[PDB]
Amino acid sequence: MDERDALRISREIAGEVRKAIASMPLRERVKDVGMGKDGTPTKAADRVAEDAALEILRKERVTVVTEESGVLGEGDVFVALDPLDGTFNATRGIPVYSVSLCFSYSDKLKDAFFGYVYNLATGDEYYADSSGAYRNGERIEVSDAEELYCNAIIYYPDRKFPFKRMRIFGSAATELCFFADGSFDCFLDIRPGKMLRIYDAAAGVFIAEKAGGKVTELDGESLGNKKFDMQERLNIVAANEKLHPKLLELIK
């Protein structure tokens, strides 16, 4: 498989998932219908989304790490799937929620070769390969803000900060992308628990990196070794090169 197949697969799925959620009225979407292998409830929207997604994926030589169904397949290419990121929003008609894939040549992020995030409410399409970062076909890159007084997406602010704006949209895959097209200046998830899971971040981090951003663990460490398993967890500090270190301090 190559980063063009990925684009094709990814787009095919975005079609099917988008179609799946569009039909389902809100009262249907919001129904807990399962326990997800993740250990959080599978809403009905999660189920129809992942079923559609998985159906296209099962045909490829891949191991899929997805939120509702766990780890599936045995192929050498690993795919980290959040078949609906921002499920909460989606069950309430709030239009920030996405399907998110990240393809890796191994079970570690450092061997990623494609990131895809598709806003299922708007149709905005984010992805990245060796050629760079795109939004709706158009090359993108991060902001150059240098002052802590910037536009921050942050999970969760636990004290007085210096930022110009703070926002939290409830779709990390999409919010990594908002950072990656310079809509926002940084992206932090500093929640002490380490809540983010491989399928939540993987595509966003990749796409953001390709768009110039510097994206690290809390302590400043690289994300390269983060694993594609159900068990992996993440904190993120993402910001262009100048801003990042200052944030790294502010967090201390």
Ligand X SMILES: N[C@@H](CCC(=O)O)C(=O)O
Which residues does residue 139 pair with via DSSP β-bridges, in sequence order?
134
The yes or no reply on residue 140 touching its own copies (CB under 8 A) is no
Determine whether the annotation assigns residue 129 to a binding site.
Answer: no
Q: Which residues contact 130 (CB under 8 A, 6 or more apart)?
A: 3, 113
Out of 60, 88, 166, 195, which residue is the one contacting ligand X (CB under 6 A)? 88
Secondary structure element (H or E) that encloses residue 73, with its range = strand 70-73
Say whether 38 counts as a known binding-site residue.
yes
In what helix (H) or strand (E) does residue 246 lie, and over which residues does it extend?
helix 244-251
Count of C-beta atoms within a 10 Å radius of residue 170:
17
191 is in an annotated binding site: yes
- The site map against its own copies for 110-139 (x = CB under 8 A) is -----------xx-x---------------
The contact mask relative to ligand X for 105-134 (x = CB under 6 A, - = no) is ------------------x-x---------
- Is residue 248 a contact residue for ligand X (CB under 6 A)? no
Residue 251 in contact with its own copies, rule: CB under 8 A: no
The CB density around residue 102, as the number of other CB atoms within 10 Å, is 31
- Binds 46: which of Mg ion, ligand X, its own copies, none (CB < 5-8 Å by kind): Mg ion
| CA 133 distance to own-chain centroid | 14
- Judged by CB under 6 A, the residue of 11, 108, 194, 214 near ligand X is 11
Of 15, 157, 224, 245, the one binding its own copies (CB under 8 A) is 157
Confirm or reject binding of residue 14 to ligand X (CB under 6 A).
yes
CB atoms inside a 10 Å sphere around CB 54: 19
Q: Is 124 annotated as a binding residue?
A: no
Q: Report how far Cα 153 is from the mean position of its chain's Cα atoms.
A: 14
Q: Do the annotations mark residue 42 as ligand-binding?
A: no
**Unique residue bearing structure tokens 């997800």:** 36
Residue 212 contacts residue 141 (beta carbons within 8 Å): yes
Let me know: does 151 contact 52? Beta carbons within 8 Å. no
Q: Return the residue of 58, 139, 167, 242 that touches its own copies, per CB under 8 A.
A: 167
* Binding residue numbers for substrate: 85-87, 167, 172, 191
Residues that bind its own copies (CB under 8 A): 88, 92-96, 121-122, 124, 151, 156-160, 165-170, 178, 183
